[PDB]
Design a protein around this ligand. Structure first.
Ligand SMILES: *C(=O)[C@H]([C@@H](C)OC(C)=O)[C@H]1NC(C(=O)OCC=C)=CS1
Length: 239
């Protein structure tokens, strides 16, 4: 088996705190080669995302851009997002409108202030995100909101998420799947529901739908370098 690796720059903060703007990651492409009975005839196989994997894929609405999000919903999952508690409920194999009772273990730790403050430009009275800043927890920044952080465990995968405590999704702008109420989705076969870890700063599947497997590029495996300026402490695994 011969895997192909591709590095990727992280220019946006939608996967914070897991991936920060300036991180440079390594991605293992899903498509790989295998040597036929030994040997000749290099054959091409394709792996698939596991729940919780951080995945690079071609943005469905404009395949020319590569997005990076977490695959929280797998083919067949009934995914529900509570915009108030900002928590996911996932029910594997509940894809036939049946009243399912099974449920993937999804648990959350207590909300705590994160290291980041999100600032906004005061454009003539209104607001527009101007960036994210790491700010000591005992300090404040004007026109900035301290983000909250907690751990989300999807089945047996635990990772962090950041929430903007003064914000709430407008469910009315979600992508609404035929036959489903707002904020509930049933992942189609061979497709995926993607969500960014910076939950209130992520234009993901909630807004535009599923990612077809054909659009998948690969799985993030490491932070190879990071610059904000060198941040060598971030090189290593993604957690
Ligand atoms: C979040 O920002 C991911 C990042 C981590 O992808 C990178 C940096 O490769 C992608 N998601 C978004 C997003 O939700 O923004 C949509 C609005 C334009 C952008 S890149």
């Amino acid at each position: 088996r011969s895997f192909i690796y591709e590095p990727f720059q992280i220019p946006s903060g939608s996967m914070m705190p897991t991936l920060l703007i300036g991180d440079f990651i390594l991605v293992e492409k899903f498509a790989y080669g295998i040597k036929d009975p030994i040997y000749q005839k290099t054959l091409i196989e394709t792996g698939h995302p596991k729940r919780g994997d951080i995945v690079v894929f071609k943005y469905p609405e404009d395949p020319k851009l590569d997005y990076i999000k977490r695959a929280v919903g797998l083919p067949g999952d009934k995914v529900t997002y509570d915009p108030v508690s900002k928590e996911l409920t996932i029910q594997p194999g509940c894809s036939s409108g049946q009243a399912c009772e099974n449920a993937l273990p999804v648990t959350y730790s207590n909300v705590e202030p994160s290291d980041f403050v999100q600032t906004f430009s005061r454009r003539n009275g209104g607001e527009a995100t101007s960036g994210f800043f790491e700010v000591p927890k005992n300090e404040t920044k004007e026109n900035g909101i301290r983000l909250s952080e907690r751990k989300e465990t999807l089945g047996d995968v635990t990772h962090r998420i950041l929430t903007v405590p003064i914000a709430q999704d407008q469910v009315g702008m979600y992508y609404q799947q035929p036959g489903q109420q707002l904020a509930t989705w049933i992942v189609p076969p061979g497709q995926y529901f993607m969500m960014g870890d910076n939950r209130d700063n992520s234009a993901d599947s909630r807004y535009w739908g599923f990612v077809p497997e054909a659009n998948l590029v690969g799985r993030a495996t490491a932070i190879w370098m990071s610059f904000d300026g060198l941040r060598l402490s971030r090189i290593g695994g993604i957690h």
